[PDB]
Point group: C4
Chain length 389, copies 4
């Protein structure tokens, strides 16, 4: 019917309610479920779908062996009806490659996938299921993007992409698309020193992207995008509550304008946050060292006050269970007068933390905000690894 | 499309014709069929569909082991095309949780699931495939609901929920919904002493819910709802013909206002009845001790006459086979001048009655009223347990 | 969309071309294929589907064992997109039971199934996917029907049914439906002495049904129905070319008005022919004793001349391979000025002919006429029974 | 919705971007994937689909054994959503047989399959999912066609067919269709000496077909068709860059009007090229002897200059991996002012090159033109033959 406008404010959030869970690993023990990683969700005027990067093999298949590997010619972005597990019989192939993003502009879905060798990858940008535009690498070092949904306003959909070293300064750009065609390209500007795997959402005409600094900061960079002017600024989350993985203990003060460093042994993980003054929530793994457990912390003024701490918390996945990437999404077409925050968490099973199996895959759980105070429990993966031995 | 208005009477019923049967256990022995329980059926303007709570594993998979357990973070309400068996490939996830209800108001389907730990469950109410409202536990003891369809009139859909002990006085409420939003909440009133798992149907502007008293009565409670004023009354089925399971022999007289006690060893099962004067039918298991066999009895005036007995009978499942839950639905959108009574019977296989397997699951059979005098036979499950050993 | 009128003549047929083949057994050896029997095809404004009675188990499943049995509470009529093999994932349940018919009247599809014990069966008649009418057994002996498509004219669809012994005089009726409601019922009239499994088609306002006399005749009965007046007559195929299975050698003369006896060891099989003066074709098995091979014979005047012999032939399945039931259907909605005859052949595999396995099932092949002189080859099933040992 | 016409010019092409890949052998090691060969892709106003000839058994099934054999009554043309692997659950049967072509005219799709014994084969021509025409073998020796998409202009769709010897002079015709009806038949004319398996595309009101001369030449025949006059001419690709398989080294000059002999040990393979002045590209396998590797060569004026050589190259499948047939297609309904070239490569696994398994099958990769300078990597099949032993 119409191009989506981001005019609505964000809903008040006081707790999180379950939206969907696919139990993909429990089911994939017997049924023919695709191996995946890097999942997310995205909505359109008719409902929500799950997305992820297949590895082009089933979980029980002998080719599941060696699926710790991030990049091959056999991966592809695939989408399916929210709640089902991803099989070869229920999935649509959005595009071919090993890094992706996707979003619907109110009229049609744009989907983007990078593929190719490390020194020569390229993106193919699709719209309405047809390929529209190709983008070659500009720094010859693994051209990559969000791994969760992008956001559109009046037909303009910004996408953050990076090309360059994972462990040093790199070349990030924001590309503004309309119907899959490049409208403008900007070089990253501001105080964020390294940008990866941006988790983005919109409200009141503004798009905010909470990302992964894989170089220095255990605090997460924040890009603020104006989709009408097609301009942006960048900096860090102000809060002393650090939310990247492999982080040190939370300091006495955060820093709005420079990375807070430290932690061991990993340099980062995709994550997210909703930032709306008092109404601010940050997610993070529970363990400061590894991708284990997951908590949501309500931290008033996190985007602007270096002394902000948590006033409430919700365990999403207990610390005895494995988590992974986490990213934001919103059902912008809800029949509501405010945009209601949602998020998912990738439940990674297999290697390298579970090395008694030869594969690496995941399942999905997703939740959405509530104004009420709802009880909670842990929504871990649920599969028994001994069954796959 | 318009709102369903309950303007028509019940059709006359003199026997029952076969509507559907999914043979899920038979087919699940090889093809990839999800483990379920608490199934049911519900219709809309286009047709009827089957529903149940998945356990988030297939029947031959290793995770089927332990599915006797009722509540987990891996259960969800799923629905599918009537007659098909539920596989991971042909089921839509309606909501996540371990107790549910659903119904179509003539415009869209409302679905409701409860999830969470015992002392802190919440319901999420969906409308048109999107989440609308959340309701937290009010008594801190397994908030739960019907396990069969709800019924709407002019957009108003009442739901019965209980929170509190299973073996003592609890806190039942009736919640009136419209487009997923709460219109009114009433506390349970009248002579019913305990309320669970109501099976409801509509005719002539009036909604009747036949329930499970898990505390005292082997006679079933009956709530009568007026969807327009949003008020109700409650009492017991008067008839001496007892229909709950683990019940004593039928006494000389029933009791309209108080429970008839006795029976061993189990406190109750979900069941149903159609109450319409002379045109009244009661379902029950054939065995008075176990969930085995299933019979329909025409007992005129069962609703109001403590002396009422059966005038005809129809065996639905012979007493050499396992039954389970049973509930009501109607195709309110049929091209008829009256509303024709339908019902389903859950056919439970595995534990605890068949402990040579490690799982528990169910198939479905469903039948509807006929004014003719149709022959009958047993519609048992039909799987051979030894093939699963 | 309007009601189909049989306003057109039969196309001239000089040859038969391949329309569809599902190869269900070859595929069912590994993938999850439902056991069936008694298949057929039926078309509507949009296309053609295949139909069959499922046994409620896959072919490699342990419940395939014992599927020689014709009647059980686990059978159902299922329909699927023409060409595919029937799996639990791509099949629609039309109705429940162990004998059926189905046809489209231009607006919606009517499907009918009979179920129940031998001395008490009943038919349920469906229209647009809803139950409309119920019909109790009238002779207390396996109420049963065509096992191929019925035909409609101005919204009236006649159906031929039989109740009574298989080896003696039985009671056959013609029931005329309109949107699944009974318009009129007639007892069988004329000189056919027993009727079973009618294969019917329409042309120039007249319905012809070629049937199976299971009692005495190796020649097949023919019923001619006028769908506007709702009347019929009956007799036998006049040709000396006998086409039932288990027949004696063709005699010097046929018999229009009485059965011709003889044949070992089978009392009959479902069959068909198209009867149109010089343009007339008779199907039959190649073997006179058994369900083996299949051939099409152009026998001018077979309907009126006891001396009529073949002038052209086409082998459809060679005599080293198993056949089964056969029946007529036509795509009444084709973009052609005449109605072109089509037919299928059921290819039975397993018991009793192939007793090294425990099951009985089938695949399908279908063909339609051509005015050209096309070459041909055998379309046998194609599976290797050793693979299932 | 209208008849497509071919007035637009070909897009400029400087490199090739990934369009789709199905990973069928990888996924079919465990999931239930049909065995195929002779694939291609074809598009319509809604998108693009993959096509291939099934062998009517899955890859892991016992009936896979023996699938090197080309012709059987079990083969059929199947199509499915682009990117998925072909299983029994998501594939549409287009027509029955062992050699095919198909294409959409902007209103509906035409599909053609040949079937039958070597000496008496026949083609059935389908339009909009309905059979329209049959055509008998004229030379009595494996009537056969393109094995990739045909092309349409203003309702007229030409198709190239051959009947006659594989290793000598044969009888090739062009038949012109409109809604499945024959508008004209022509004998092959011009200097091409033998024609098989033409790969065709349209531009500037003209259709060019790049074929396989199986008789003498390692250079490829080129048939130029005018779909308005319904007439054609023929000769050979002029370039010294030879593109058929089993070919000698490239000579110093090609030959426009006669075959260039040599190569061992195979007489040819299906291949393609796009011919547009300086904007011309030729595909071929990397190995001169065998179906291994695959490369794209930009060769300015290949269609007219015998001295023309490559100015740029892109490896599509490396020379350590198996390839196979290759063909052209275009998405004629893209939103662009030019027709952008696309192509596929068939990735043959199993026999005869990999004789440790009993089967032959394939997977698919397809790419399209880019005006940009995109990097590349190999798109080989991906499966480990040792997992099938
Ligand atoms: C039922 O579930 C609800 C929702 O999870 C629980 O409410 C949570 O309760 C904990 C502990 O009472 C609260 O932690 C308070 O947290 C702040 C910030 O972390 C901390 O500074 C305080 O010392 C205190 O621990 C948490 O805020 C609250 N989360 C909510 C309401 O979202 C409730 O406890 C559960 N009820 C039962 C009976 O288990
Ligand atoms: C055929 O089925 C019908 C329907 O169930 C049977 O009719 C019932 O008859 C029994 C025995 O007289 C009564 O107790 C029931 O009240 C009747 N029930 C209904 C629903 O009508 C009939 O008995 C069966 N006939 C045979 C020969 O078995
Ligand atoms: C294209 C690509 O390789 N993406 C990968 C990125 C980057 O490798 C790192 O963020 C370092 O840049 O993150 C992962 O490796 C990771 O941390 O689990 C997974 C993901 O597949
Ligand atoms: C899922 C899991 O077991 N997490 C455990 C982790 C991991 O074992 C290590 O991080 C792996 O190196 O160790 C902890 O000390 C932690 O980090 O909180 C306890 C936690 O329960
Ligand atoms: C929410 C929940 O656990 N519901 C369960 C109820 C309750 O146990 C009783 O109604 C007592 O409240 O009945 C069952 O357990 C049962 O008897 O088979 C099944 C069902 O899953
Ligand atoms: C399915 C089945 O076998 N049911 C039988 C049951 C069960 O064996 C017990 O309930 C097990 O506890 O026992 C009966 O006496 C009964 O309950 O009526 C007879 C009935 O045939
Ligand atoms: C309802 C029913 O059982 N129909 C069956 C009929 C009857 O046996 C005969 O027509 C005698 O009435 O034919 C079969 O048995 C047969 O010959 O293979 C198959 C079919 O299932
Ligand atoms: C499929 C097959 O082998 N059919 C053969 C049959 C069967 O073997 C017998 O009917 C077994 O009862 O026997 C024939 O004489 C016949 O009936 O025509 C020859 C035919 O080739
Ligand atoms: C109908 C048919 O058999 N087509 C086959 C053709 C012809 O055999 C040859 O082109 C010689 O005519 O090509 C193949 O054999 C081949 O070379 O791989 C495969 C294909 O199945
Ligand atoms: C996939 C593969 O292994 N290809 C190899 C082939 C084949 O082994 C032979 O053609 C088998 O006949 O041999 C080569 O010399 C060639 O043809 O270029 C090297 C190439 O790497
Ligand atoms: C291989 C197999 O399962 N055979 C079963 C057999 O055990 C059983 O005795 C028979 C009767 O039901 O059915 C069959
Ligand atoms: C797994 O892959 C490794 C390396 O590719 C190989 O050595 C090993 O044999 C494979 N293991 C299995 C169980 O397939
Ligand atoms: C079944 O589950 C129990 C408890 O988790 C476990 O001890 C046992 O090993 C499992 N048995 C099988 C056969 O998987
Ligand atoms: C070709 O199609 C275009 C677009 O619909 C149309 O404008 C044009 O008239 C057509 N050309 C011819 C020659 O039919
Ligand atoms: C494969 O087919 C051949 C020839 O039909 C046969 O000899 C052999 O037994 C079959 N092999 C297998 C493993 O089935
Ligand atoms: O069981 C209810 C009724 O069923 C019928 C007859 O058998 C009656 O005698 C009986 O009262
Ligand atoms: O956010 C979760 C957090 O809640 C509080 C304490 O119970 C901690 O142990 C726990 O890590
Ligand atoms: O040649 C004899 C031949 O005549 C004709 C038919 O009746 C056949 O059944 C028979 O075999
Ligand atoms: O196939 C030709 C065939 O036609 C018929 C008869 O005339 C036969 O005598 C003759 O052999
Ligand atoms: O109708 C088929 C029939 O045709 C004639 C002869 O070739 C027979 O051998 C064959 O059975
Ligand atoms: O076109 C591919 C071709 O490019 C040039 C060389 O690198 C060759 O080795 C290679 O085969
Ligand atoms: Ca970091
Ligand atoms: Ca009770
Ligand atoms: Ca007979
Ligand atoms: Ca050649």
């Amino acid at each position: 019917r119409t191009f989506l406008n981001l005019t609505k404010p964000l809903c008040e959030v006081n707790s999180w309610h379950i939206l969907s869970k696919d139990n993909a690993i429990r089911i994939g023990e017997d049924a023919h479920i695709l191996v995946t990683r890097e999942p997310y969700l995205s909505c359109d005027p008719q409902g929500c779908r799950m997305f992820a990067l297949s590895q082009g093999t089933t979980l029980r298949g002998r080719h599941a062996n060696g699926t710790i590997h991030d990049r091959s010619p056999f991966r592809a972005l695939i989408s399916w009806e929210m709640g089902q597990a991803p099989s070869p019989y229920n999935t649509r192939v959005e595009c071919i490659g090993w890094s992706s993003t996707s979003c619907h502009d109110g009229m049609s879905r744009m989907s983007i996938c990078m593929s190719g060798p490390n020194n020569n990858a390229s993106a193919v940008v699709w719209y309405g299921g047809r390929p529209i535009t190709e983008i070659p690498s500009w720094a010859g070092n693994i051209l990559r993007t969000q791994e969760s949904e992008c956001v559109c306003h009046k037909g303009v959909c910004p996408v953050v992409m990076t090309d360059g070293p994972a462990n040093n300064r790199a070349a990030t750009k924001i590309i503004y698309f309309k119907e899959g065609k490049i409208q403008k390209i900007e070089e990253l500007a501001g105080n964020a020193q390294h940008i990866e795997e941006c988790s983005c959402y919109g409200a009141g005409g503004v798009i905010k992207c909470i990302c992964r600094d894989n170089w220095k900061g255990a605090n997460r960079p924040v890009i603020t995008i104006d989709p009408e002017m097609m301009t942006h600024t960048s900096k860090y989350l102000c809060s002393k509550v650090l939310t990247d993985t492999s982080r040190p203990n939370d300091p006495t003060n955060g820093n709005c304008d420079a990375p807070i460093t430290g932690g061991s042994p990993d340099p980062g993980v995709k994550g997210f946050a909703f930032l709306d003054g008092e109404n601010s929530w940050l997610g993070r793994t529970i363990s400061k060292d590894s991708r284990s457990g997951y908590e949501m912390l309500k931290v008033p003024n996190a985007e602007t006050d270096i002394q902000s701490g948590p006033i409430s918390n919700q365990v999403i996945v207990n610390n005895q269970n494995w988590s992974g990437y986490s990213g934001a999404f919103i059902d912008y077409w809800a029949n509501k007068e405010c945009f209601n925050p949602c998020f998912y968490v990738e439940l990674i099973r297999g290697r390298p933390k579970e090395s008694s199996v030869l594969w690496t895959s995941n399942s999905i759980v997703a939740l959405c905000g509530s104004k009420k105070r709802l009880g909670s429990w842990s929504w871990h993966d649920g599969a028994e690894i001994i069954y796959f031995e």
